[PDB]
Amino acid sequence: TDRVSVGNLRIARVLYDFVNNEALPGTDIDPDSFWAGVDKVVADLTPQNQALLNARDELQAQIDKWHRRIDMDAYRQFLTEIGYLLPEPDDFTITTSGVDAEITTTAGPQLVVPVLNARFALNAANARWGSLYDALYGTDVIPETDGAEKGPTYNKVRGDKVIAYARKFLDDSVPLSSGSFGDATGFTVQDGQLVVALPDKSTGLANPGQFAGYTGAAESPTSVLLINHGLHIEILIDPESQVGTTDRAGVKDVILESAITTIMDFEDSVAAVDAADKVLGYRNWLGLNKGDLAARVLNRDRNYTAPGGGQFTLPGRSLMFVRNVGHLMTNDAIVDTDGSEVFEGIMDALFTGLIAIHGLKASDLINSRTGSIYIVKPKMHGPAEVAFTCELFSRVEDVLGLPQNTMKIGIMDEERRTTVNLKACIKAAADRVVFINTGFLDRTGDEIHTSMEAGPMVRKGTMKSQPWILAYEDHNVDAGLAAGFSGRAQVGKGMWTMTELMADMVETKIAQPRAGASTAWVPSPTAATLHALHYHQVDVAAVQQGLAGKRRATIEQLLTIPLAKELAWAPDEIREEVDNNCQSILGYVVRWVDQGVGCSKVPDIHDVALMEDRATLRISSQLLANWLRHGVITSADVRASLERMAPLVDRQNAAYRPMAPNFDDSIAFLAAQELILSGAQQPNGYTEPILHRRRREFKARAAE
Ligand SMILES: O=C(O)/C(O)=C/C(=O)c1ccccc1[N+](=O)[O-]
Ligand SMILES: [Mg+2]
Ligand SMILES: [Mg+2]
Incomplete structure (x- = not known):
């Protein structure tokens, strides 16, 4: 085996060499101190990480039984009894300090890019x-x-x-x-x-x-x-x-x-399933912080003359976040003595945080001028899960020798148990938090999975207008403004996925700054320059102060489950949702599994190019898993649909491996099917377990 023993850990060698040879030199951190830190942090934090994951399953099982035996007073009382709905903390104001102006003050677009693609990640950093x-x-x-x-x-x-x-x-x-x-x-x-x-x-x-x-x-x-x-x-x-x-x-x-700011993604838009994959990811992240990543090169800063006559400069690069993965997955890049894989999230903190130190120093001219390391943490459930991420960052700062609270955290509000306790989640990180952001795609998948036993949900498209999501969007802004986010932290909204429909983005996405959001997500540099228009027409600072103090969303609105009314669809409507869902699943999964591409454009049933990633995948398979669960469709329908759409996706891809005619010979095709048929049994509907396993299994049979 090509592994390195360090205490109780066995480090995949490719990752071992990369840290010693590329990420540690420059930081003044002694390699053996680093790896004893990894060892010690993994040993001390892994048990609670697992406790928190078990908390999830226990809560979902009680909610499942409950539905199987629609009064909102009873529902709210039961959620409170089982500790799902925790009390609201007393009003407070965040103390996060040392944050750059692009986050405290400036309202504007926020680009997200897969860190495993260097040409994209460069254009994004340059898209300032x-x-x-x-x-x-x-x-x-x-x-x-x-x-x-x-x-x-x-x-x-x-x-x-x-x-x-x-x-x-x-x-x-x-x-x-x-x-x-x-x-x-x-x-x-x-x-x-x-x-x-x-x-x-x-x-x-x-x-x-x-x-x-x-x-x-x-x-x-x-x-x-x-x-x-x-x-x-x-x-x-x-x-x-x-x-x-x-x-x-x-x-x-x-x-x-x-x-203004760009998020380099290690999560839902990349496919990294082993040390080889994470090292390409980490290497790009390092080349971004060191300034020397080249595919195309990072832009220099821009030189101006002030109206008075002096010189000055402005940043030529977008201030970079990195999105770690959340608390769920483990990655075999490190296994322990008993062969157990190490939690991927704990590793990203250690490794992206280490790498990010290069962004605090001069590059042969910097990221954060005020000393912060900006880490988006996704897919958290509740305030305990936030406090844990905080503790993890505290122990990583120790191992890295960073001042405490260097590692700031952009909170994704994209899980139901986070939404209904959002104030308490903000308080748990009151001195660390740099944004809250409505991860509405993830947050829809958790909406479906949580209430999976209650009954059939409404069609995927109906969901962007259901009461619960309109309430969740307002409640997010109200909580941020209440914690004093205005002038301190970003209040962020979600991604525009219709990559080609830019006239529609310019016409409708203005809704986000008007709703008090100081930032919102764009998929391309072009989409960022066109979304920049809305911040010139909307005074977000004004909008946010007109909002301060309002309470626009009650707990009952947030808990309004998107059930479908009694017999609400014709055959042509039901078939189209299935066809449209199966095709988006297929067109995404087949490039994930066969080629390790974590985001790609897949045209829906109406031929609209949708930028697909793991969150839109969780919606598709969870919705279909729910219709299957409640009789809306048969297993014949799912398979007929998957088979009708498979060859169209082949056409759209015509060095790639077709799925038709030999469907049960395609690992990518079988993964699509499993995401649906097993979807109700994945934890919280998460697609990584099926995706990582099927990707690993393709890489293995491709090596034989
Ligand atoms: O709704 C959330 O869970 C969320 O975080 C969504 C995104 O991440 C996303 C969704 C579709 C395409 C591309 C991205 N992306 O960020 O690049
Ligand atoms: Mg997400
Ligand atoms: Mg003006």
């Missing part, structure tokens, strides 16, 4: 700045009506619409004293203020404070930098450029400050 011309010209925010269609070459009819769109943005964000930007013919900086040339007059900024800087000579600058609600707009000025030639002010582009 994004071309708005590119985002309007490339997507459907400029519709492709007659004459405005994208071709192989530039469509100036379309590009002129792009200019016109952006001009209206400039007018509505950084207004002139009089006139419009569309009538601009030039820009100069004189006596520290910005003067815009109009045809017949010459106006300046209504709020000249919105003037932030410029590059080049003030006599005629190369760009003009503006600020509005804490976010920067940079007008690029280049007449002999291709777009600028046509522009009335020689404007070449409008750069938006976009992905």
Whole structure:
């Protein structure tokens, strides 16, 4: 066996060498002190980690029996009796300190990217700045009506619409004293203020404070930098450029400050099932903190001249979080003496936290300037599970020699037992917490699994509008604002998965900042630059203070189970949900299992590209597992559907292995089936157990 004994642990050698040879040098941490720390932390914390996991099963079993023997007073009383619904703590204010401004103050988009893909992770870190011309010209925010269609070459009819769109943005964000930007013919900086040339007059900024800087000579600058609600707009000025030639002010582009923070994902969008997989993950995370990851390279910072005349710089990179995995899974990258696998979550803290120290120091220019290590922790259930994550970070800080509370924690509110105790979860981390975020996809899967025995749920799509989720979204903001999150921590909302439907994202996702969210999740750098628009039209700081003190969601609203009313569907409706669910499951799982791809675009039954990840997978299989459980469909239907959709997914992928015609010969196909047929028996509906096992089994038979 290629393992390394360290006390009670047997470290997979690939991981052993990587830490010693790549992650520890630079940190001043003695390798044997590190590995005695791993050993000791694993030994001391693994038992409660397991106790907490058993707490989950015991609660779900009591809820199961309860349903099997719809009064809300009784339900609330029973949940209280079994310790599911814990009392509300007294009002309080978080004490988290040492946090960078991108999280305390600035409201804006938040990109999430799979850390196992270096080209993506680089573009995400770079997406702090994004071309708005590119985002309007490339997507459907400029519709492709007659004459405005994208071709192989530039469509100036379309590009002129792009200019016109952006001009209206400039007018509505950084207004002139009089006139419009569309009538601009030039820009100069004189006596520290910005003067815009109009045809017949010459106006300046209504709020000249919105003037932030410029590059080049003030006599005629190369760009003009503006600020509005804490976010920067940079007008690029280049007449002999291709777009600028046509522009009335020689404007070449409008750069938006976009992905303020980026989450490098080790969880639901990657497939890492062994030390080989985690080491690729960790290595990329290291190359991000060290600054030297190259596929494409991290951008330098941006240089400006202040309106006064001095120089200054702004970060060229998005402030990086890392999303660890949660308390459930173990990974054989480390086994113990008895052969038991070590909990993956404990390992990510040790290893991503260690690696993140490189981001606190100068790179051959930094991540956090204030000394924090920003860790999203997902899939927690209740305040005890938070206090445990806190304790884990405390022991890792000791092993790493970091000051206490260096390791900050972005709380995912995405599990029902966290929602209905959210105040207490925020309090458990009152000195560590940097955001709460509504992980609404995960949170729907737990909604289905928790009440699986109560009856059939409503269709997947009906769920984004059910009472419980509207209540959960408001309750989240109310709790964050109440804990004093405004000006201290982020209040975050969820991912826009329709990667191609950018006109719809620009039309509807504005709902999130309007709901008091200082950040919300985007799937691409482009989506971040287009979601940046909403923070220029919504004053989130104002919105949050208008909200402060409100209580908009009662406990009964949150506990409104999404049961389907009595005989609410026709055959064509039931079949379509099944077909649409089976195809999303298949199209995702087949790339997970056969190729180790943790996120990919899979077009639903209506041909809309949906960015799929493990959370949308938990919804699909849990819903179908629930309809199967309550008679809505037969096992014939599930198999017919899985078989009808399998060859379509083959077509959409046509170096990959088809699933049809020999379905029971495809490991990926059998995994899809198991996720459904076993779905009711996976803990809390979690898909990693089936996914990790089937991925491991494909890698093994591929090696033989
Ligand atoms: O609802 C939550 O549980 C949540 O955390 C969702 C996401 O993670 C997500 C969902 C679909 C695609 C891509 C991502 N992503 O983050 O990259
Ligand atoms: Mg404003
Ligand atoms: Mg999630």
